[PDB]
Amino acid sequence: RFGSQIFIEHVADVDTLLECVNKKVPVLLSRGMARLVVIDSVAAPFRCEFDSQASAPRARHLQSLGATLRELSSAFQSPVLCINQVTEAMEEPLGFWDERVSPALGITWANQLLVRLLADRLREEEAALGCPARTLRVLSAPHLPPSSCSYTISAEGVRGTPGTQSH
């Protein structure tokens, strides 16, 4: 029964998200309904409240959220998947030399993670062949080399292209 074993929550503020992860999530994990946590956009609440001159409160909130998420994941052995947005380089470091885009939320958020992925799509300039080009890349991991592959989106779901992994 796929439908009845998925729970959906809505938040609007950073404080609302913090309260949700502090109160509602542990109740669901402890009783055993779910063993997977997905955040649709962690960067969305933080990009609407803090400017370039308010880095310290944002860092405090990010550290608290990361600590709470890591504690819950370690306690209940449930993977945590976070979806993030990107910002351009605006060339005038962190390992991104010739990349046009980089993950958002700075380096404080990047210190809280374990495996960092990156999904990229080449626009019509490189996608003038008829179909969009999508590549899923591994940025860093304690046990995975930097690699990449290709995938397509269809009516069935996301499927990777066989014989495409780069070494």
């Binding site: 470091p93 962190l94 390992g95 030399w97 700075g106 380096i107 404080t108 210190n111 080399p145």
Partner: protein, 98 residues
């Protein structure tokens, strides 16, 4: 940890205990730290975290750069050798040179 003084006291005590253990049992203590952006002048640069008092709580300090697609291991503080710069990279076999 909102109270900075408690953190400083704990860090100093931990460093003293670790150096005592190393000298008493003939060990080689290895510690790992994190980098933090500091907006100096107007061009931000990465500096080690945990404040400035912690700076001389370790006998030897090493920093790993990124430069331009090239990993560099630069010695920072040591009572035996002058600071220099050395390149390195990670292979599927582990920590290697070249």
């Amino acid at each position: 940890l909102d109270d900075l003084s408690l953190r400083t006291r704990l860090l100093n005590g931990l460093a003293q205990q670790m150096i005592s253990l190393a000298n008493n049992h003939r060990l080689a203590v290895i510690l790992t730290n994190q980098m933090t952006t500091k907006i100096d002048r107007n061009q931000a640069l990465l500096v080690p975290a945990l404040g400035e008092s912690w700076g001389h709580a370790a006998t030897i300090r090493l920093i790993f750069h990124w430069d331009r697609k090239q990993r560099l291991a630069t010695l920072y503080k040591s009572p035996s050798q002058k600071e220099c710069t050395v390149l390195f990279q990670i292979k599927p076999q582990g920590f290697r040179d070249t």
